[PDB]
Amino acid sequence: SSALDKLKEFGNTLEDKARELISRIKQSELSAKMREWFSETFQKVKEKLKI
Amino acid sequence: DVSSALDKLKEFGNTLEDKARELISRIKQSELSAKMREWFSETFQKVKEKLKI
User: Which residues in A lie closer than 8 A to residue B10 (C-beta atoms)?
Assistant: 22, 25-26
Interface test with A, best of B14, B22, B24 (most A CBs within 10 A): B24
Domain boundaries, chain A: 1-51
Contacts of A4 in chain B (CB under 8 A): 27, 30-31, 34
The count of CB pairs under 8 A between chains A and B is 51
How far CA B28 is from CA of A2, A14, A38, in Å, comes to 13, 16, 51
Experimental method: X-ray
Torsion of CA A32, A38, A40, A44, to 10 degrees: 180
SS (H, E, C) chain B: CHHHHHHHHHHHHHHHHHHHHHHHHHHHHHHHHHHHHHHHHHHHHHHHHHHHC
CA dist B12 and B14 (Å) reads 6
